[PDB]
């Protein structure tokens, strides 16, 4: 009856492959998010440092 245990393992391995793929999607979404955060941070720093060089 070991073949039964095998089809159970195959079922759970399908599920974990799916979760890994969802995981890599989510990581791509964090890479996106961090790129927007860097963009926003640099825009802020540039406005500041333009005003700074202007005041000199």
């Amino acid at each position: 009856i070991l073949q039964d245990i095998d089809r159970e393992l195959d079922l759970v391995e399908r599920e974990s492959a799916k979760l890994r793929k969802k995981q890599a999607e989510l990581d791509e979404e964090e890479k996106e998010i961090d790129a927007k955060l860097r963009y926003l941070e640099m825009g802020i720093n540039r406005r500041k440092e333009a005003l700074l060089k202007e005041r000199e």
């Binding site: 979760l19 998010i33 825009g43």
Partner: protein, 135 residues
């Protein structure tokens, strides 16, 4: 007569000068106050100009921090889903291992016994074949 008429008119002159001189002093003092105010108005216009620019850039900074909070909230929720995902992953590994442990349970020390019995009997049959080859 004419003598007193002249003295009346001479006075009227003195009085008219006194009026006009007083007025002249009012006017040029008033011109002072107007120029000082023109300069002040200019200073105020310039402060308002600078202050409107500071306002514009601080509004820009404010839009940028509002956007960063939106994006950082996105990051927080993504990390949450990452965690939930990884926790499912661990549950699945732990199920897989329960099945792998039950698979291992399937073991048989009874098949070696038939192996040895069969082996000896095959070679007992070989013994019989040697003795029948002999004749």
């Amino acid at each position: 007569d004419s003598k007193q008429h002249i003295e009346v008119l001479k006075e009227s002159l003195t009085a008219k000068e006194q009026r006009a001189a007083i007025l002249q002093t009012e006017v040029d003092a008033l011109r002072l106050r107007l120029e000082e105010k023109e300069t002040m108005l200019n200073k105020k216009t310039k402060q308002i100009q600078d202050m409107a620019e500071e306002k514009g850039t601080q509004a820009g900074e404010i839009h940028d921090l509002k956007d960063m909070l939106d994006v950082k909230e996105r990051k927080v929720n993504v990390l949450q889903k990452k965690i939930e995902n990884l926790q499912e992953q661990l549950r699945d590994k732990e199920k897989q291992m329960s099945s792998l442990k039950e698979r291992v349970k399937s073991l048989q020390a009874d098949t070696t016994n038939t192996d040895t019995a069969l082996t000896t009997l095959e070679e007992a049959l070989a013994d019989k074949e040697r003795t029948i080859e002999r004749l």
